[PDB]
Structure 1
Amino acid sequence: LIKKKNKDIRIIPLGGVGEIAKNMYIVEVDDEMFMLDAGLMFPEDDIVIPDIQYVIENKERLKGIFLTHGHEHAIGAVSYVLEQIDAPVYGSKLTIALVKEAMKARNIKKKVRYYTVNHDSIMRFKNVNVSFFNTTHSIPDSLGVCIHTSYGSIVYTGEFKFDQSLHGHYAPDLKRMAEIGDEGVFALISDSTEAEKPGYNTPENIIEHHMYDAFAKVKGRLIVSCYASNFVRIQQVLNIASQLNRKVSFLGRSLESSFNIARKMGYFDIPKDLLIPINEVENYPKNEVIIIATGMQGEPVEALSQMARKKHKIMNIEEGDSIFLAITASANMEVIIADTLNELVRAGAHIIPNNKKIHASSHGCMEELKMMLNIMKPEYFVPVQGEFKMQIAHAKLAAETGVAPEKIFLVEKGDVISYNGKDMILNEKVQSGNILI
């Protein structure tokens, strides 16, 4: 609910537009400033982070940092932000955990005010109240942010999907979303990542079923390559390993921090004595182990090339091994997969083929996005989290749902959307850019 009569709204993207990552969206209501996410981008073509010079010059007015989910595209730059500025950090139980770990990992001694929020939390400020709602993503406890103004709600979806099989901390708040919609949404800021792809995602249970049928035929050792970010896909192989009386080992010699924190907080459903350390692998027959190679940048692929070319520090591929790629390939990574496949074949490994009829994504396709648009019914729309072609795609979806085209804004980094109370205008441009580290 609303506090006072507001005058000025400003919306400034410093990251996540005209590119696919580095989420950072500034929202101002009068004299108060809020930062929605603080992602990094893995330089394609270490890391890249947004230019926050605009924020620093107006540091006095930054009331909070709001973090939608635990991925590096949301919270990857937070440590670097907190070095230059002191503001309170708001996020879910899991998101705060992962941020704190990033701070511990960088040996940063700065004292930080962390506020754990949930879909029942309602954070109060001078000009506005902020609420939250659960979304569906590849990681549990993902939140949408709802900034309540006199003009209506400013909603930032974060990254989201709509899957009728995900039903835990992965489940969405369709009633809280419908209520936000009818109370009236002034502005919607939504994920455009798969806005070009017609229809829907393949449901996760369908993907799991096809993985099961594939893995059940494997007579030898099985190695699965995954993104560490994709908690669902990891949960899926744990389920399958258990039903096939196989045991699971990650690449060594300890367990991946994100996975291991979430595991210790009870986010994974793991039976007893299912994980064996990589040091205990040799003891078991080849057909009783599933090895999972996780990573972030695209190492998941690199690791298999190093396992094929003998040449892995820990463990190498043997003839009769089965390989499965439980990832979704960026066009930048299509060639290195084809090299790796060749080397896998030479080393005499069986390639479990991906079903081409399956579409796996953390992000909603056209119909999923239209779903959020139909629910929200925003007056103004700002498609983000995509390149220019993706933003356009999302805009056409919005126009179809009945948002006025005059009220849809396609913006670049540093663009400033202002609302006087009469007209919404793109009238300014501020300092923005890419800081490589």
Structure 2
Amino acid sequence: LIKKKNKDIRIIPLGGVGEIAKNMYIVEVDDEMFMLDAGLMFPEDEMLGVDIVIPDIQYVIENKERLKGIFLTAGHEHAIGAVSYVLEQIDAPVYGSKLTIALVKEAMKARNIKKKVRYYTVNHDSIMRFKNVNVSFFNTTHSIPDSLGVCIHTSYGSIVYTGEFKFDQSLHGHYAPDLKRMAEIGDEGVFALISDSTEAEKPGYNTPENIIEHHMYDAFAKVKGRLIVSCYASNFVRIQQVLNIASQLNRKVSFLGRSLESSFNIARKMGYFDIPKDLLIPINEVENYPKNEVIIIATGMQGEPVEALSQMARKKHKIMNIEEGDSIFLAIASANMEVIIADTLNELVRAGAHIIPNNKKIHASSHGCMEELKMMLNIMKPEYFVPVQGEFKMQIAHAKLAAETGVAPEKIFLVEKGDVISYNGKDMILNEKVQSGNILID
């Protein structure tokens, strides 16, 4: 006669607000706690002797008996970079797409962590049933395939976390978004939407990837010597574009960086790339070709591309350095990174390299611009809105979009790390803080 109902909700960012990476959002529904993403951030300019930055999870450790799962939206560093460190401290099942799980398993192997982990590979048809709530998933579009949003069903309506996403009609297959499923979620009733603010300041739409690839062909066709493309190892779309263009221009492709080899190998075995025969060469073989017959994709050792480019520009790289007359395509900017980018570009000009200019007509990111964020807000029609994944100015820009779409302004929460947004069935409040912070890994 009595149906179980939910009473108290908590939403707590431990990473990803006040900054551009390191997503980690804790959602509690009564006595069940869920961790949404567990990303890393690369060290800020002002940091020395540091490899990566991860969230402080002391609040989760203090309450770990209630942690029911870790839910990972995609296989990029902003979503999974901290997972291995989390798993060394707490035990919970790990839920993610086929690709995301394979990349997490590789990361655990790479750090030689042998604890038993309960992985669950989910897809957009999966419904994971807990005591208090059910969790479902929906395909999103990103630069890595097999990305998923997370939908926590409550008796107040859904709590939806988008992860990182954009909308681009030129991406299909494992990049295609679940627009019909998202409309169903919005119609059934969304209590709170937690959405990516990274490009909320940028009007219009991201430039479609087909048009980006056309522009890359035109730029690459003009390069007279070697080309170095600097991008994230998780930018599979960009890697695929380079492979296609290299084939068209009779250039070979070689990977520089442990991050790329690893992620590419896994993704290739699983079928995620279209790779012509004889296109890929070992980095050791690059110097055996004419300069105009090679493209080097340079990701970082830990996945940070700019650090590797800086090493190459100063001729400090262990494996391969920049030479006069090389050309650079920089396919990666946050407040955290603006200084190293400026210094690296100066270093490259000093070394006699040629930076391929950005096209004014082109805006390339993995994150929705204003119209894409408004599309998500209009589909989901949330009662409350929590903009995340951004510096505070980005969160504010995203809050402005939500107000434009009709979210009540007093139901928009602009949060800092460690803030607790809480609901008791009557009022949504911001009246508590938990421990949070940046953990430095060396």
How does the TM-score come out when normalised to structure 1? Answer: 0.94
Instruction: Tell me the residue number matched to 2:42.
Output: 42
CA shift, 1:5, in A, is 2.0
CA shift, 1:253, in A, is 8.3
Name which of structure 1's ranges 308-317 and 223-232 shifts more when overlaid on structure 2. 308-317
* Residues 343-400 of structure 1: CA deviation (Å, up to 9, x unaligned): 4445443432221321111111111101100000011111111122211111111111
CA shift, 1:82, in A, is 1.3
> In structure 2, what is the Cα distance between the partners aligned to 1:347 and 1:385?
35
> In structure 2, what is the Cα distance between the partners aligned to 1:386 and 1:2?
42
Name which of structure 1's ranges 184-193 and 332-341 shifts more when overlaid on structure 2. 332-341
> In structure 2, what is the Cα distance between the partners aligned to 1:67 and 1:364?
19
* Residues 243-265 of structure 1: CA deviation (Å, up to 9, x unaligned): 22221111268952122211221
CA contact (8 A) 1:229 1:296 kept: no
> In structure 2, what is the Cα distance between the partners aligned to 1:154 and 1:3?
20
Distance 1:404 1:339, change over 3 A: closer
CA shift, 1:418, in A, is 1.7
> How many residues end up aligned between the 2 structures?
436
How does the TM-score come out when normalised to structure 2? Answer: 0.93
* Residues 9-67 of structure 1: CA deviation (Å, up to 9, x unaligned): 11111111222221111111111111111112222132222222221222111111100
> In structure 1, what is the Cα distance between the partners aligned to 2:264 and 2:258?
14
CA contact (8 A) 2:42 2:304 kept: no
CA shift, 1:238, in A, is 0.5
> In structure 1, what is the Cα distance between the partners aligned to 2:208 and 2:226?
27
CA contact (8 A) 1:4 1:128 kept: no
CA contact (8 A) 1:3 1:129 kept: no
SS at match of 1:212: helix
> In structure 2, what is the Cα distance between the partners aligned to 1:92 and 1:194?
25
> In structure 2, what is the Cα distance between the partners aligned to 1:354 and 1:251?
23
* Residues 274-320 of structure 1: CA deviation (Å, up to 9, x unaligned): 10111222332222221221127785344444444444432334444
SS at match of 1:5: coil
CA RMSD, aligned part only?
2.3
> In structure 2, what is the Cα distance between the partners aligned to 1:151 and 1:116?
27
* Residues 208-236 of structure 1: CA deviation (Å, up to 9, x unaligned): 10110111123332222222221111111
Distance 1:208 1:128, change over 3 A: same
CA contact (8 A) 2:144 2:237 kept: yes
> In structure 1, what is the Cα distance between the partners aligned to 2:247 and 2:2?
50
> In structure 1, what is the Cα distance between the partners aligned to 2:425 and 2:304?
49
Distance 1:296 1:283, change over 3 A: closer
CA contact (8 A) 2:228 2:327 kept: yes
Distance 1:121 1:2, change over 3 A: farther
Name which of structure 1's ranges 406-415 and 348-357 shifts more when overlaid on structure 2. 348-357
- Any gaps of 5 or more consecutive residues in structure 2? 46-50
Instruction: Tell me the residue number matched to 2:48.
Output: none
CA contact (8 A) 1:88 1:112 kept: yes
Distance 1:202 1:85, change over 3 A: same
> In structure 2, what is the Cα distance between the partners aligned to 1:341 and 1:50?
30
> In structure 1, what is the Cα distance between the partners aligned to 2:330 and 2:144?
19
